[PDB]
Design a protein around this ligand. Sequence first.
Ligand SMILES: *Cc1cc2c(cc1C)nc1c(=O)[nH]c(=O)nc-1n2C[C@H](O)[C@H](O)[C@H](O)COP(=O)(O)OP(=O)(O)OC[C@H]1O[C@@H](n2cnc3c(N)ncnc32)[C@H](O)[C@@H]1O
Ligand SMILES: *Cc1cc2c(cc1C)nc1c(=O)[nH]c(=O)nc-1n2C[C@H](O)[C@H](O)[C@H](O)COP(=O)(O)OP(=O)(O)OC[C@H]1O[C@@H](n2cnc3c(N)ncnc32)[C@H](O)[C@@H]1O
Ligand SMILES: C/C=C/c1ccc(O)c(OC)c1
Ligand SMILES: C/C=C/c1ccc(O)c(OC)c1
Lengths: 525, 525
Amino acid sequence: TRTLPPGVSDERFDAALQRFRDVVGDKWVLSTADELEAFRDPYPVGAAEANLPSAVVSPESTEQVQDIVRIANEYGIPLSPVSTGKNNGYGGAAPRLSGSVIVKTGERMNRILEVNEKYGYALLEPGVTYFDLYEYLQSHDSGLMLDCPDLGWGSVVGNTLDRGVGYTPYGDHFMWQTGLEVVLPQGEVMRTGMGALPGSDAWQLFPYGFGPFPDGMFTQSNLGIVTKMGIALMQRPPASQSFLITFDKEEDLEQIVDIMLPLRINMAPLQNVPVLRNIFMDAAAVSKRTEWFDGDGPMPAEAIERMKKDLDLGFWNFYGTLYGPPPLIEMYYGMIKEAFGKIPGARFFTHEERDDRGGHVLQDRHKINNGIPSLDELQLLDWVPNGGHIGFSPVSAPDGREAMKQFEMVRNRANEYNKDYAAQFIIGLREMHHVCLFIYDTAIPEAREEILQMTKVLVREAAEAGYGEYRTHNALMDDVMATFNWGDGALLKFHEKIKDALDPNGIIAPGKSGIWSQRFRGQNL
Amino acid sequence: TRTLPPGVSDERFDAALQRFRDVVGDKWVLSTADELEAFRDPYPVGAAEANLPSAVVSPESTEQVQDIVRIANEYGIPLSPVSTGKNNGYGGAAPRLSGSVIVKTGERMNRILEVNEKYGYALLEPGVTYFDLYEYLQSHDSGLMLDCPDLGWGSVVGNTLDRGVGYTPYGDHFMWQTGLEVVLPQGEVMRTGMGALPGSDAWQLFPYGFGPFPDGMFTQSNLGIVTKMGIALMQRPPASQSFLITFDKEEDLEQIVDIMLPLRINMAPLQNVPVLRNIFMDAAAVSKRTEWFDGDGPMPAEAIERMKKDLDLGFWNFYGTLYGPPPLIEMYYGMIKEAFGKIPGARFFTHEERDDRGGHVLQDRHKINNGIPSLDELQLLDWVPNGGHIGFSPVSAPDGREAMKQFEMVRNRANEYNKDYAAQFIIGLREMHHVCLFIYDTAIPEAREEILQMTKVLVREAAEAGYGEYRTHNALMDDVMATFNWGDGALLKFHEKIKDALDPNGIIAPGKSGIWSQRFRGQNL
Ligand SMILES: *Cc1cc2c(cc1C)nc1c(=O)[nH]c(=O)nc-1n2C[C@H](O)[C@H](O)[C@H](O)COP(=O)(O)OP(=O)(O)OC[C@H]1O[C@@H](n2cnc3c(N)ncnc32)[C@H](O)[C@@H]1O
Ligand SMILES: *Cc1cc2c(cc1C)nc1c(=O)[nH]c(=O)nc-1n2C[C@H](O)[C@H](O)[C@H](O)COP(=O)(O)OP(=O)(O)OC[C@H]1O[C@@H](n2cnc3c(N)ncnc32)[C@H](O)[C@@H]1O
Ligand SMILES: C/C=C/c1ccc(O)c(OC)c1
Ligand SMILES: C/C=C/c1ccc(O)c(OC)c1
């Protein structure tokens, strides 16, 4: 049947659609079943249908966004804002609440408003992709570099709004976000920071402004539709060098992490955001599962050994980058070798030293860690047919015992539900994002349901061990928010109060981060 | 006459006081005229009496803070939270709204809850001063260092909650804040970030947690009473060196700033937060005004030259610190000399090369910039009798011309109101906090009034030129918030909406940052 917003009739939904067309143009509102297929989660989770959009609206400007918001308030139509809608692993462009209208800001609001070479910043609309900004920087012979996630087709803005991550020293996107413009849930427009001071030139210079600092409240949030965002850009260093350290054993995880911490916490000699990837992650990037194993169930030990040998990789593979004058690089690299060289079986390779298939990941990281966006990691989804992934993404202390515990816990369930567990620890100064990608066949109802049930188990079991997720998929948002229930669910109650105050009609992305406005609470969708 | 909360009778106040004594104990509620004299602003602004507390309550736990808040809500009594109450220049411990009860959290909530050597952080109650944490670190032979403002008697927490600043690489306090516990305006308690996850070890490891990120909303804010805060701590480097560069001309300001920017924006060779201080600031630190000029008006140029010559300082004096192995320090100092040595008249001194009176500020910065707290700068307040100061603190782009225009704009009004303009530019990566301290005799009603009128003029003039303040005094909060009125006052309306939703009875620090809850709006308070 036609997907309709909750509580809204065919007839009223038709009238609302026409008003959206009055604002944006007929070509810029999609509402047929065929046209909406493209906006389904590409990596669906759960057997049953879920996260169904009712329409897609593509506004050209902040004023059109305002008008759309006003219409949605009058009709009681929920709006789900995206930038580019490439949140794959977490839902793609699909709304948490079925029946919502997707507001695809990035389709037409895709301008680079300013790149300031002197002060090292950009001012962006939501449709500027990493590729788009890279092209700009290259075209203008900029001395600045961007910080990108693994896939360059996402949005500088949109990735930041979900507190996404990259891998240069500017890898904490939200840290470097400076100023934003947002349309609030009843249609009012607001600028944060120094941008609230008319005529200031400091909107991208000083993030805080005056008074309570609100920008974080627009991240992983349903408090508005963001229309402009600033971000600091790092100066490109004079030289760089990337390296891979292979570690032979699953059980080396503990020592790897413990040796890493003292080298990272001061931002030297580990200057970039290191990643520690398991052999499933690296093999999926360069090969299909049937190259190593075509039986049933989890891949046997002997098959794991063949991936390692054929690709010349370890069970754990550490990738980092160094920057600066050549002698600084050499000094740092020497320190890294000496430290991690304690682990029996450790082998080191720079980006100049390996040109082979297994080395493809190191070459990709050398691009990414130098702000050169890439789509090479899309190959991961060829690991099994109709491949998809979901991101289960607990936070870990930068402690080997903790990391090992988390690894063992996830691996036990992955094996039990027959899903391959590819791991990427993303290593900050004092924490790691432990990204667990389960790669699966999206066509098969039981695969999708095992994914859902396995990840619900892992959310709960992680939380019982004191671990929480940094980011999650539409299907897990209620379960993850339910783990952050210190003080009798104080955090969620606080969010809901602000939600209801700013969005009295319950319009913007209901259910994002488990935050449902009053009219939807307790309805279980 | 007895100071009472607004619309609260003598008897209703006496009843409240009793309820507060029941919670905290008799000794820990102050309510006599002369016990309250000590909580008046030490540097009063304006001729007329303002910012009068009705009582001070000193809780020993979060549970007590919750009960005090519940009592206040029942009675309609405003509560103005402070940590140590040393926000001198901006109000001291005094409340914005006369008749509020000061909640002096730090008197008895003064425990160092954790200092973690491995992960480099502290979890703190509000009463922990910089001197307290320093003593802890020294006693335990820690490898960590703290980051302090110029006066060590403040609160690690309280300073961060007003987005205050220090001078090491960790000098953006709010940037390094990681987790907090807050009592919300009806008495609910909440932990942010990973602290919301029961049993997490990552409260001080990963700041954002899950969902909308709220910690900024409790800074320069009246949304709660903070009871615990975490902060990252830097590893002490193996060596450090501080330096002074003196510049001879008032007109050198533009070139100093333009040369500085490329050396600062990448955190090297200017690793620390540089300060650029004028001769008035440095002379006040070491000498009284009457040493150089006796006369009620602006200091003549010949007296300025005498200050410079006797103290062997410039009109502009640049202070920085370098850290790391001794060869790194040498490369960076050499670069700094080569760049700033292009300004005619520039002279360079390390912390080993001055033992004279004018060198005293260098020695003090060498402490501060190494996380060694000091109160030597209290000498500034001896510039004139009964000395006080107010901070007029605009943000500047790191542009020489902008810094010069601000300098000239402020200097001109200072002349007109007969106040000396002491300047300290605090230089971030992409912005400067341009702190203007006006030092005056707090005992002369007319001087307190000129300070008020002058600074009201400066706020308006600066906003007409596109400059806003990062932080301000109780007397200026409304005027400063009024400058940030892009989009017909959008930012303030947003803040009011949240305030009213969290604080329906209008209890917590009414008027902080210009944010008044519903029962107080449109009033002359
Ligand atoms: C499958 C996968 C995913 C992945 C990755 C590797 C693989 C194989 N590596 C990643 C990495 O290195 N770092 C990282 O942060 N994420 C990584 N991913 C996940 C995903 O690809 C990316 O994060 C991607 O950049 C996110 O998608 P996009 O950038 O297109 O962002 P979006 O879908 O438009 O928005 C995400 C959410 O943010 C909120 N949002 C977005 N725009 C707005 C506006 N304008 N206003 C309000 N809120 C907005 C929404 O919640 C939206 O859903
Ligand atoms: C006169 C002066 C001041 C000064 C300075 C040099 C001189 C000569 N140099 C400074 C510097 O280098 N950096 C800096 O940040 N400030 C400097 N100042 C100003 C002042 O001395 C310090 O900032 C000082 O540390 C601040 O005072 P304190 O640390 O005691 O903090 P507070 O008065 O307790 O709190 C300030 C405000 O924060 C909010 N607050 C505080 N505690 C709470 C709790 N628990 N809950 C909610 N809000 C709280 C209040 O708004 C409070 O007024
Ligand atoms: C190789 C995968 C990287 C990744 C990093 C961070 C994420 O949140 C993520 O989500 C699917 C994926
Ligand atoms: C020497 C003055 C330092 C200072 C720095 C930052 C401030 O906000 C400030 O305010 C009174 C003072």
